[PDB]
Amino acid sequence: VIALVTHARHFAGPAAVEALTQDGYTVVCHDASFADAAERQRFESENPGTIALAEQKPERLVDATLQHGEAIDTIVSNDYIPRPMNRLPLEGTSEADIRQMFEALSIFPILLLQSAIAPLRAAGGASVIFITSSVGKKPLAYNPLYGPARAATVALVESAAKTLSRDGILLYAIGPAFFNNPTYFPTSDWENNPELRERVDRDVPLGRLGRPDEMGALITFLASRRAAPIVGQFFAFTGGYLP
Amino acid sequence: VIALVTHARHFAGPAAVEALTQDGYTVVCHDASFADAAERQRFESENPGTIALAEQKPERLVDATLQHGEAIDTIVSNDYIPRPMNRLPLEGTSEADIRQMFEALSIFPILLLQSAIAPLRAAGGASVIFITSSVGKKPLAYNPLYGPARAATVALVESAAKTLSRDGILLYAIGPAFFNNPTYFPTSDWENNPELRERVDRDVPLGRLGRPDEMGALITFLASRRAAPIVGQFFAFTGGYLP
Amino acid sequence: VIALVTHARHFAGPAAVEALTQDGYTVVCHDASFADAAERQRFESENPGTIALAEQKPERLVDATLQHGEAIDTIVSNDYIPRPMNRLPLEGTSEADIRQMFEALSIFPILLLQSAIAPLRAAGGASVIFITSSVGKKPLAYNPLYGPARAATVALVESAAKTLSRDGILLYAIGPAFFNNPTYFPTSDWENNPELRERVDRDVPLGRLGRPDEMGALITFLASRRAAPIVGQFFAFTGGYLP
Amino acid sequence: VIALVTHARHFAGPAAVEALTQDGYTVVCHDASFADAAERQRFESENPGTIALAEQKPERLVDATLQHGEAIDTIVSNDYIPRPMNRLPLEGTSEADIRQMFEALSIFPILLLQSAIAPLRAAGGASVIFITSSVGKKPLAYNPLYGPARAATVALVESAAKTLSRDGILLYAIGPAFFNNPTYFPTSDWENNPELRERVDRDVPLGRLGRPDEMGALITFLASRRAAPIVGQFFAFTGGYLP
Numbered sequence: 001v002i003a004l005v006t007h008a009r010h011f012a013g014p015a016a017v018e019a020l021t022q023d024g025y026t027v028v029c030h031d032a033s034f035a036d037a038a039e040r041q042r043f044e045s046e047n048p049g050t051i052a053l054a055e056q057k058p059e060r061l062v063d064a065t066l067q068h069g070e071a072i073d074t075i076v077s078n079d080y081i082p083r084p085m086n087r088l089p090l091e092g093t094s095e096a097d098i099r100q101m102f103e104a105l106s107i108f109p110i111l112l113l114q115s116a117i118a119p120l121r122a123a124g125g126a127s128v129i130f131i132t133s134s135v136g137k138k139p140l141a142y143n144p145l146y147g148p149a150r151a152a153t154v155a156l157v158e159s160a161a162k163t164l165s166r167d168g169i170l171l172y173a174i175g176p177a178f179f180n181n182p183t184y185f186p187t188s189d190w191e192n193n194p195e196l197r198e199r200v201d202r203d204v205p206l207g208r209l210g211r212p213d214e215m216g217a218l219i220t221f222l223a224s225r226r227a228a229p230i231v232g233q234f235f236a237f238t239g240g241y242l243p
Numbered sequence: 244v245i246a247l248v249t250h251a252r253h254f255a256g257p258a259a260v261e262a263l264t265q266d267g268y269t270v271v272c273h274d275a276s277f278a279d280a281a282e283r284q285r286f287e288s289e290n291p292g293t294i295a296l297a298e299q300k301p302e303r304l305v306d307a308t309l310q311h312g313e314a315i316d317t318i319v320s321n322d323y324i325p326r327p328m329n330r331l332p333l334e335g336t337s338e339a340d341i342r343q344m345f346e347a348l349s350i351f352p353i354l355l356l357q358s359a360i361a362p363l364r365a366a367g368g369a370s371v372i373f374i375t376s377s378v379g380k381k382p383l384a385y386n387p388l389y390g391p392a393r394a395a396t397v398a399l400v401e402s403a404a405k406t407l408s409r410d411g412i413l414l415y416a417i418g419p420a421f422f423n424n425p426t427y428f429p430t431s432d433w434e435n436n437p438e439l440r441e442r443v444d445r446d447v448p449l450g451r452l453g454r455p456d457e458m459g460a461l462i463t464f465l466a467s468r469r470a471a472p473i474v475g476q477f478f479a480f481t482g483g484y485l486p
Numbered sequence: 487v488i489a490l491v492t493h494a495r496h497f498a499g500p501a502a503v504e505a506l507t508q509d510g511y512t513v514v515c516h517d518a519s520f521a522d523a524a525e526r527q528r529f530e531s532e533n534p535g536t537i538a539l540a541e542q543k544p545e546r547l548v549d550a551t552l553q554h555g556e557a558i559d560t561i562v563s564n565d566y567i568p569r570p571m572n573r574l575p576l577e578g579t580s581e582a583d584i585r586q587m588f589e590a591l592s593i594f595p596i597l598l599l600q601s602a603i604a605p606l607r608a609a610g611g612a613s614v615i616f617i618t619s620s621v622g623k624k625p626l627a628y629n630p631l632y633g634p635a636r637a638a639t640v641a642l643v644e645s646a647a648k649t650l651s652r653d654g655i656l657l658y659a660i661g662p663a664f665f666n667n668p669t670y671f672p673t674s675d676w677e678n679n680p681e682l683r684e685r686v687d688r689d690v691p692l693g694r695l696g697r698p699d700e701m702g703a704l705i706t707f708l709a710s711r712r713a714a715p716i717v718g719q720f721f722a723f724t725g726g727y728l729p
Numbered sequence: 730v731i732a733l734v735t736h737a738r739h740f741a742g743p744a745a746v747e748a749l750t751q752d753g754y755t756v757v758c759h760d761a762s763f764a765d766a767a768e769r770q771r772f773e774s775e776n777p778g779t780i781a782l783a784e785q786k787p788e789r790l791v792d793a794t795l796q797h798g799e800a801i802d803t804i805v806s807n808d809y810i811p812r813p814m815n816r817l818p819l820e821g822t823s824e825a826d827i828r829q830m831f832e833a834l835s836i837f838p839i840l841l842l843q844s845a846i847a848p849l850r851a852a853g854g855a856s857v858i859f860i861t862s863s864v865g866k867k868p869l870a871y872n873p874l875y876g877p878a879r880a881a882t883v884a885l886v887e888s889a890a891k892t893l894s895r896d897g898i899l900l901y902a903i904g905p906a907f908f909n910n911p912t913y914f915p916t917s918d919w920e921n922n923p924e925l926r927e928r929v930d931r932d933v934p935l936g937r938l939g940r941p942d943e944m945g946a947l948i949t950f951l952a953s954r955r956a957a958p959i960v961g962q963f964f965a966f967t968g969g970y971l972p
């Protein structure tokens with residue numbers, strides 16, 4: 001049973017590869033770094049049971065994954081943009097940066113999803129889990145460009161699900177905040193940053209960052225299809241920070 | 244492991260009981276019919292692993308449950324109003340029916356919750372899962388009193404989670420629609436009533452009622468605490484009808 | 487052209503009376519203090535163009551108002567609870583206080599609305615404007631009972647609008663926060679409470695409390711029926727604190 | 730006293746021009762046809778008190794508008810995509826069409842808003858009114874691309890308002906559905922399409938198309954800034970179809 005995970009070295013990627021591999025999936029992985037054959041080999045060495053794709057185009061990931069299996073059971077569309085770009089303000093930000101924000105967080109997942117429909121429908125269904133952000137639903141003053149691009153992909157999930165769910169193709173969005181992960185909250189900064197630790201005590205009812213295995217537990221539960229009627233919505237992964 | 248499930252014979256009750264007992268729980272059950280001791284003996288014999296309480300007051304259920312075990316791991320607050328009161332209109336409805344709507348759907352879960360905080364905190368945490376309705380978030384023309392009462396309890400979950408999550412007491416709301424259950428979508432309606440399958444085809448992207456085991460899968464997933472960061476929010480169980 | 491404002495002395499009452507009287511309305515006012523006849527004549531003397539009702543039951547205010555005119559053009563359902571109670575916690579709170587929360591903020595507005603439909607329909611339509619709270623839509627840690635009660639009435643507006651709009655009976659909910667009013671944010675508090683000014687600088691994009699005349703401007707605009715297609719929704723009145 | 734209205738000949742453009750001019754504004758108008766000198770002269774002569782711009786690039790509209798007055802009081806960002814591109818499906822749709830959807834509905838408004846910030850702040854504030862769509866908040870099965878692009882601009886309003894409000898720059902999003910307008914619901918469609926009249930009867934509580942003067946009343950009310958604390962939110966203009 002195979003899963004496709006995008007941007008595997010970033011954001012919720014490590015968590016998704018870990019939990020899905022432990023669940024018995026063969027995890028086929030995309031990452032910008034995988035254009036390099038050497039980085040492909042190191043990744044597979046460091047992550048038993050994975051396959052690293054060379055393909056970089058969003059519309060070609062599905063065809064490239066289908067080289068290593070009969071069908072795709074789960075796609076984790078783990079879209080991200082490197083820090084500090086997520087905090088780019090409205091004023092003075094270049095048009096290139098504006099377009100890149102939508103390219104990485106809205107156009108890339110659309111082109112992926114579009115390419116996926118036909119093969120996934122032929123296999124009788126699958127799950128597509130988009131990793132977005134809390135600002136997909138709740139706005140933040142310092143994310144005035146990141147927020148809009150994330151909200152587009154949340155709306156993509158809720159609208160596209162109205163039609164794809166009848167094909168057995170189940171779409172979901174996760175909107176993390178205060179989630180322990182290499183892109184926005186690496187374990188290295190927690191101990192050194194007492195403003196963060198005070199921010200979490202103030203704003204996160206759970207009182208801690210969410211753990212990689214808890215993100216992994218949500219992903220594997222969704223991939224199992226055992227609760228299919230919750231298809232088509234946004235799940236906050238924020239320790240109670242949202243709503 | 245102890246679970247308390249309220250109104251066990253109705254709504255989400257049977258689904259919860261089947262799945263929690265299958266996951267190794269001892270399920271302590273409340274139900275109006277359990278005033279009669281013979282009902283209590285029959286329910287227990289038909290459902291291995293369950294203990295039927297005689298207690299009927301919402302604020303005494305926790306104490307009565309703690310007569311059978313050291314701590315409660317999960318409370319399923321499975322509140323409901325007999326069909327067809329869920330469709331009571333605004334005009335011509337008695338003040339007494341209006342108050343009963345809030346009593347069963349809004350006051351009762353609050354008195355339950357308030358009684359549970361001290362013992363659940365002292366035990367190190369628990370999960371408290373409120374079964375509400377889709378109209379807890381999205382209004383429907385025929386539910387102008389049922390909706391308000393359900394929305395209150397969804398707001399209870401979202402607000403009370405801000406303080407209780409720090410005690411390890413994890414609250415959630417499930418808002419079902421088109422969920423195959425004896426109160427609102429019994430199998431008999433699916434078989435007998437031509438209009439229901441027509442409605443589901445038009446309005447439910449999944450194209451079917453939600454199964455009891457699928458509701459059960461969600462309840463036992465939440466009760467495990469493996470994805471604790473999703474605390475404090477509303478989950479649609481509608482097959483894509485919401486949002 | 488007559489308007490009915492409830493709890494005229496508190497919350498959004500003074501703003502409503504002032505703006506509506508300025509817009510040419512004869513403002514019939516309900517208030518608990520009006521059970522004392524001296525207070526009725528003091529109120530009418532201090533507020534030219536008002537009528538202070540003796541009536542206190544919600545379901546009788548409409549008939550009491552039609553003693554002074556042939557139709558009600560606008561109802562401002564200005565429900566409130568005396569200040570400290572909006573912060574009532576779950577733990578240790580008496581059943582009586584819980585029930586009074588719902589009585590003032592959820593049952594009283596329903597019983598008023600129920601009583602108004604037939605005369606309002608007979609008169610070709612009207613506007614009913616419910617003054618609720620920001621916590622009707624966005625939860626807050628310190629409002630776990632006030633929140634539920636307010637959310638019930640916002641959902642009442644959203645549900646009841648689905649039928650009553652066809653009668654020309656236009657329902658709206660306004661949800662204030664940081665609104666300069668005698669109940670929650672008197673001008674006294676702004677000068678006396680440096681914490682309030684810091685909190686407003688931090689959390690309110692507008693940077694200031696909303697003015698009574700701005701709340702009046704919202705009310706009179708809704709009462710005009712000039713933008714009727716926005717019927718049946720919740721308007722944040724928070725200086726950008728919501729969403 | 731000047732306003733800028735974009736795509737003046739489409740969507741909410743005619744409503745905004747007529748109402749703003751009736752209200753005493755000099756309305757500077759952008760439109761794709763205004764590249765034709767003869768179309769500019771004809772529009773100006775058919776619409777007394779307007780000024781037609783030749784400029785077509787979003788980030789130059791403001792400076793071109795400022796050629797005619799010292800300050801802009803209101804900007805109506807009236808963004809649209811020609812029918813029936815709003816119904817573009819996921820499958821088979823070209824990459825260029827996906828990109829054009831975001832260009833017209835998401836990137837164009839962002840580049841306009843960015844260019845406006847500095848001169849609007851120097852004038853001590855202004856109103857910026859984005860005309861989006863009901864699908865910016867509520868998904869629809871047949872708008873899986875139009876929805877995401879609209880949702881991004883709604884999220885832009887909600888996020889950008891967190892900072893721009895302190896400058897007196899007040900942002901709002903209006904989300905029409907069943908709004909009588911030349912692009913999506915011209916009067917002739919109401920006459921030629923009994924399916925449309927039945928859909929409105931079934932789904933729109935108000936029971937009719939929203940009128941252009943009602944959209945103009947909402948725009949003109951927002952432009953007055955008289956109820957500034959409602960800044961930074963989405964207004965349904967749907968006749969109760971939403972929420």
Ligand SMILES: [Cl-]
Pocket residue numbers: 176177178179180181184185
């Ligand atoms: Cl995160």
Ligand SMILES: [Cl-]
Pocket residue numbers: 419420421422423424427428
């Ligand atoms: Cl159901």
Ligand SMILES: [Cl-]
Pocket residue numbers: 662663664665666667670671
């Ligand atoms: Cl207030």
Ligand SMILES: [Cl-]
Pocket residue numbers: 905906907908909910913914
């Ligand atoms: Cl429209």
